[PDB]
Assembly symmetry: D3
Homo-oligomer: 316 residues x 6
């Protein structure tokens, strides 16, 4: 079997980068819409007995892209592909990973079931919002970390990183922030927005010392940037000299760009798990860490039957 | 168990009509989008041990609506509903019902599998593009016909219906047209657009006599109205006095409204399996047959454990 | 893995032809009946890690043959075959492909589920009564066409084929007839037997012109030959000079042979998806198109991981 | 839900007896064959929300009957039956319950899987050839014993039953014979036909004393009656005064009737799990124990949610 | 259907309390071991059409208890129970909820799959180590909180609770601690043990102010009490006046009792999701919050088809 | 793919013998217990695309070992092993192979389902208590016989084996004993313990002649040795000169060692499907037949795609 890399409509630049790093051309696929807005998928080459990797991030037109991915997976399976792997850099519906409300769906589990029934044999993803999403499948799920790339960026772009403090913008980010602070041998802090019992002012509590130090906000994603912007205001109010925000998934939906442009961030750093070209044109603060080499190495090692553990300590 | 009727965002007027005919209020659901365009479903009441019917047509934002339906089905199932029925008046991806091309997906089968894995126990639909889609599920699938309502409309709105000829706009509609012509005891004709071997003019062949008679075009759906418009030009060129078009699913996507407005149709008749309010505002030729009574009777009989065979001979 | 071709009891001559065209000997199998008429299957060689193809048509003792096929598939799967493919030239129960009656089974879907649970990984079949039967499986299903062979036979055996008209014996055959007429660039006609509302005479309506022309009846199968015989009487009554019947599946059950012998057919042409040796001995009108080369090429390309699209335009 | 009893073509007299004992009329079903010998099933009444019991023994046209049963189960399931129970008095393919040969199918497991995929929720059967067949399903399987009826017949029809010896015709029947001998407080013996290493004479070894005593052969079934006839010759050669044969399943296929008529049996006693009317007309030695009351009580208790343990100690 | 409460061997006192609060006697079950240490389960009464709740905590002989629970679930399912619910107060293998190591199993997902294949229709559990474990099933999973009972205990047993600080013993407990601190309107702190890069001294970092205040350690479980004991030493070293530890699952395996007896805890508070009678006899610091009323109310509401949302704000 | 042999904690000496006979080192696995007695499995090497064989007998801590095996299977599957085979020399819960009691679980079927859901693709086992357990899986199950090794031991260790009688200790062993007696061309006898109707003395009935002959007791297993010890007393009381006991599974749980030491056995012969080192230290009568060569040959032939039928006639 040979590696066949197919791109959905979501992140075709990332698919191209992965294919170039693998020394391959992208597989021939026409991914369009019928007139009635139904997804049209036209695989333009044989995938018989091939090791098919479909790159599709959960971003942009989320349901459009997920349906595109499912249809492409099913087409490859029925076309007798040896193995179909869904490379989903940003897993859609990952934040709907539990039922903590009455009648609430576990949409991440539904997406996992849909991918399984479409015929996916393997999932490659980066920085799942909850790592337990790996357990939502009965197939192997690669949950790659952007943490080595984040550490590289911090050590190369922040002069006073050895005296910095890594800040969690919410309680759920504590593990990620503590891991990064341990790897950098720096202090960490946590910011919590307390629960909205009524319609008074949202107030943020900070635990840890950030006074007269550079604060690096690290989180898994910035959708509306309410979390990171509120954390940034709190950090400046607490005496932080400079505030950075580093995310792996830059969704930047809704008012995020205006929020960041009016915030105090020295830089907002995201990976290219989601296309950022449009976002960077309206926000100069955004910088992008390319993770295409990580995904390409993961695909290559999956095809060659080699461990991907190397990707959790080094940036290829 | 009690009937609980929930509406998706696709066709809420039809859901309201069904609920009124059942003497019920629509179940409390908030069906919106998160900022990143992920589907948000908030069922506002208990469905424990209830007989849940979710009305969602395949129309408008097709993938949005289908994801909404799947999430609502899964939420109801996890919320311990006694039974979850998907009332899908127009089945999405129904035209992708076979693999007659290399690497082509069977998207209808994928949609059926997704509905099954979401937890649907029963499907109620009207005039499946292919009746074999019933076989795409392992659960009961009600394939209701709009034919009795179509016959009622023909007998009440076309004065010379006894001398009319029912015309199939393509080869695939032949069974539907022959059934309608048999029930009306009238002649039938078939129109075929021959295959596009090269880039010459599309030419249509008509088998049957339509000269100096009213021609009624009957088809399962009109998406772009290319089929019915081309058939209408052919019918007028063949000597038909007046041309009607009767569909059960009025999709009217893309250039359909301009096509119909510039066509020669006496009337374009569709059911309300898809919302038509916007379409009727731009095309006076469109008239709507309400099928909400058929769907309401089907839901009521399903809940009461009664046969729906009555719906195939009478309009309630 | 190597190709292993196993024959059921249904069509062993076709299995032999396929094996010869593949340059193989048929796999050693004893397919008999126990005393109590239970199916006895004794695979006489190892199939470990082999690519097993089991040839069994739906014909003769239908349930006997289907049980034989299921038992052989399961034996091969438990015997650790790399892949088990059911080569079913005529799919049994294919006409029971929908539920258009109260309490009616979808027997084609049940057969598909039984084949899936027996362990079939791939289905190769010719001219499914409904192409949507491909969607009854979650495994790849090859629906081969006899149309290229039919076109070859028409062009080589009917002198006036360029002025002929291809006739559908019922409404459901319209797509097949229009496709053949397009490929031959000839006229087409359709014959419909209207629905039996009471016990009066069955009357047939013909749409299209067949007067003073050769009429070729093309259908997917002739079980009792009531359809083709009634169509032939109608065609002669309408002024057709000569009438041919071309089918892909010659079932010829019940009164079919006497019907054909007393009909006006110039020739009844079927493929050898079903054994015809016995039928030809009692009806001189029957001629057979060998499709063993099509099936052998399909099996060879499936084993070699090559596209079978070539089989839809050429007869090997 | 109400009890609905449907009969297949196999044993309709037993179905009638069960229905009469339940105070019900048999459900309206037409079970015939299409012209091409495909099974035709036409359920003539609604089974919506009903507790459906389908009676079909594995006998006669075995594959015909099993396909009939599967199609009826699937039709009832798709017709929205509350529960579908397969009442299979003699389980087909029960003797193919293991793989003790290379490439041998486990046909009993395949039949169980087919019944499960057809939609059976419950199996009621009598005296499975191997009780472990209960484990071939994931649904409850009632394995009823004919042993209480056998003990009743022995105590009422054999005057010297207290001095009799119960004889196993093979090694596999030892548990059944020991259980019966324990319940009767009588001696037991075992007869073994040693393995056919070459083409010499089949010789039978008897362990236990049967001299000058009545010998009762007890086995689960008599298909060809080779086992019981050879055992009877051995028992007479060993000095048994009279020889009885008691089976629960009288298959009597092939040469069984001539074998019994030429044997020395005082009586051959079978239950009516298989129709015996034809067999009794050609063999006066055959007597029938009616087990319809056992099956009717099992169905009634299953419907009422009551234990069937009473059936293992008493004959209702 | 009626509530049937069955106890495994793990926590029979809790099962008795639940049954008393439900006004029921525990179902008759013998749960012992065969001589070869295989689990023996003997359900002593009919569960036909019953709503069966099996109480079995993941504690003590973990694999013994889990196998007991699976066997009891399967026995109830095969015994035709209407519904089988596994009441698992402490979910076993819950800490193995992700694959963050090479070749690491997701044991929680395996346990969920085993419960699903045993036939569980519903899971009721308290304070899952990861709430995403709800997504490991395709059945409803009730993840009850001990938080209302914890808040009640804090407000009734700690005089200076309004000036206390709730402390997370690790980064993963941050959400639980922030929720509790929000509900009490008190400060919170977090303690992190940094990663063991080499064999130097384990050092703990504290973020937040605990000086001269009562510190309440809140975590989901205390297995070896290394986390809470190390956190307690850190809290005293940081100037906390008194230190409490509140857990929902008191596992107290290995050296936990000696660790607590030599620690500085004012009280170690656990629920009775795990039996604590033996632990309290050797550690006077341990106090138990009874949660049997929460579980009993959850079971009663599940049986009655009522929401359990009331249990997340009130202690019944 | 390469053979990877992994050992559980149950029988590591047998795993070592298998690995040596295969010329391999055992795969690196740490199989321990967490503090709370949860199974900890740490596979120490890549199994990507490997043919993994996990050796784990059902013995010792039965539930501990079975959970270990399931966790290791699941870890190998998620670690992308090409194929995972469970080598289970003594199948746990094999005696719970049917439901012959009210509410009784079929624990063997549950174990099979658990192995299937863990991801096992193949099962290799020796002398299943019921061969129908092969039918409890949908994957191939190798049921190897210790009979050739038993025959070798008899012919090499019992001087008067040609005049011996092979004795079944119960009715269920009759097939095994008759097969062995046929292969040795010797007499056979059967011993039955009649059912315990009340609390009187257990009495044993012997059918067959053992007077003044060596008696060889052959059974599939000796758990408590009650069966073989009672049979030995009966055989001596019946005039047997010497009594041997040959089992394939020596469980020897509970009072078995004291029972054997106080019995009259010339030798108790078992295979090493279960570790016997501890048992032999307290009972000199126990001798061990090594079957590691049989298991190693089975694994090697499974990997090489060769028949294992040779293992049923010869000891490698
Ligand atoms: N150091 C690590 N940190 C986090 N996750 C890891 C780590 N090592 C492995 N994983 C997880 O395990 C998966 C597979 O691990 P890998 O080392 O590539 O080999 P294997 O597939 O045999 O376990 C990765 O995709 C990742 O999800
Ligand atoms: N021209 C065609 N007309 C009809 N069916 C086709 C055609 N081409 C392909 N198919 C269908 O697609 C199946 C597989 O197509 P093929 O071209 O062999 O490659 P792939 O399996 O990769 O799709 C065929 O078995 C057939 O059912
Ligand atoms: N005494 C018995 N001997 C043999 N099988 C039995 C016996 N009692 C029960 N069974 C088996 O258990 C099944 C169901 O048992 P039953 O006592 O009716 O209640 P439950 O279904 O709750 O177990 C029966 O159909 C039969 O297969
Ligand atoms: N306030 C809440 N906090 C956390 N989990 C909740 C809450 N409300 C509901 N849940 C979760 O949802 C499950 C079921 O919710 P409930 O309100 O009882 O009704 P429904 O089952 O219809 O959703 C609970 O068992 C719990 O896991
Ligand atoms: N002589 C035999 N006696 C008993 N069981 C056998 C015998 N031959 C084969 N089997 C069973 O069949 C299984 C596989 O058989 P084998 O001959 O190795 O080839 P195949 O897997 O192709 O059937 C064995 O593992 C065993 O369970
Ligand atoms: O401990 P024991 O019961 O004596 O030995 C196990 C026996 O139980 C079962 O019948 C096995 O076939 C053996 O004969
Ligand atoms: Mg967060
Ligand atoms: Mg059409
Ligand atoms: Mg923790």
């Amino acid at each position: 079997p040979n590696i066949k890399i197919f791109s959905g409509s979501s992140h075709q630049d990332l698919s191209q980068k992965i294919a170039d790093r693998l020394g391959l051309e992208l597989g021939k696929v026409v991914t369009k819409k019928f007139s009635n807005q139904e997804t049209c998928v036209e695989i333009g080459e044989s995938v018989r007995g091939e090791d098919v990797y479909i790159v599709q991030s959960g971003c942009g037109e989320i349901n459009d892209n997920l349906m595109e991915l499912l249809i492409m997976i099913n087409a490859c399976k029925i076309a007798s592909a040896s193995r179909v792997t869904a490379v989903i850099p940003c897993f859609p519906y990952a934040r709907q990973d539990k039922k903590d409300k009455s009648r609430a769906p576990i949409s991440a589990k539904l997406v996992a079931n849909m991918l399984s029934v479409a015929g996916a044999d393997h999932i490659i993803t980066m920085d799942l919002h909850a790592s337990q999403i790996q357990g939502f499948f009965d197939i192997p799920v690669d949950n790659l970390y952007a943490e080595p790339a984040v550490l590289k960026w911090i050590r190369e772009n922040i002069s006073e990183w050895r005296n910095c403090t890594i800040v969690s913008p919410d309680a759920g980010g504590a593990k990620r922030v503590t891991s990064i602070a341990d790897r950098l041998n720096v202090d960490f802090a946590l910011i919590h927005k307390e629960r909205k019992k009524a319609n008074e002012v949202d107030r943020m509590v900070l635990v840890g010392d950030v006074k007269d130090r550079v604060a690096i906000l690290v989180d898994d994603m910035a959708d509306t940037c309410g979390t990171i912007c509120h954390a940034a205001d709190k950090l400046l109010s607490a005496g932080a000299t400079r505030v950075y925000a580093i995310l792996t998934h830059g969704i930047f939906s809704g008012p995020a760009i205006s929020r960041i442009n009016n915030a105090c961030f020295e830089a907002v750093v995201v990976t290219n798990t989601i296309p950022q070209e449009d976002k960077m044109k309206h926000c100069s603060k955004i910088q992008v860490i390319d993770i295409s080499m990580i995904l390409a190495e993961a695909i290559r090692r999956t095809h060659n039957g080699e461990s991907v553990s190397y990707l959790f300590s080094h940036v290829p």
